[PDB]
Amino acid sequence: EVETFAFQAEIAQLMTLIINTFYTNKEIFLRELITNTTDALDKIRYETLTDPTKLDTGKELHINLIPNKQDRTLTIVDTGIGMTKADLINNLGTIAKTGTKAFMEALQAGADITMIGQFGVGFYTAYLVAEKVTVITKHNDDEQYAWETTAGGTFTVRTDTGEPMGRGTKVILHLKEDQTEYLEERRIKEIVKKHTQFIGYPITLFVEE
């Protein structure tokens, strides 16, 4: 029931660079994941212009940020178009071989890690703060799947038996021990205000008891 895949060499190389390079401005991961959510939400809205039934899986269009200090996880949930199994396998709906190669070439020329989104591979910035990332997703044309990687050159894909999502993507960041500031309400609010003020969807930061 669990399939294990090797990353393409270039993507493994970029993930190692992200994990091993000294770079203090780690907060940019949240801007990148919220940006991906906003793009996925725009995609389902665009499809709904010609087929209103595309929203039968959920009419709410939103992004939720759910910190969990007990599990040391930060979960980003959106109700966007979601990814099929093929999209997960194809580097989470990106042309990441091309993007990761171009980004690493720009870094060699003096660009910085914060420019990752310009290369269409911003998702991998999750590894600045997370030791493991789980991506649960549901697209109207496929079943609910879980993608997961702790880097190390491979990722797994499995059918998800967890809480059904209806439609969209949930990114669960299992944070590194020294990166728990990203579970603090004031810190998350600061990052969203700084980097995501023009995202056209409600971003709700959940409170913990």
149 binds ligand 2EQ (CB under 6 A): no
Contacts to ligand 2EQ from residues 82-141, by CB under 6 A: 82-83, 87, 92-94, 120, 123, 137, 139
Pairing mode, strands 63-68 and 203-205? parallel
Place of tokens 């199994």: 85
Instruction: Give the span between the Cα atoms of 46 and 81, in whole angstroms.
Output: 10
Smallest distance, ligand 2EQ to C-beta of residue 137, A: 6
Measured from the CB atom, the residue of 87 and 148 that comes closer to ligand 2EQ is 87
Measured from the CB atom, the residue of 78 and 148 that comes closer to ligand 2EQ is 78
Smallest distance, ligand 2EQ to C-beta of residue 67, A: 16
**DSSP notation for 19-77:** HHS--S-TTHHHHHHHHHHHHHHHHHHHHHTT-GGGGTT-----EEEEEETTTTEEEEE
Measured from the CB atom, the residue of 128 and 209 that comes closer to ligand 2EQ is 128
171 binds ligand 2EQ (CB under 6 A): yes
78 is in an annotated binding site: yes
Instruction: Give the span between the Cα atoms of 74 and 65, in whole angstroms.
Output: 7
Smallest distance, ligand 2EQ to C-beta of residue 209, A: 26
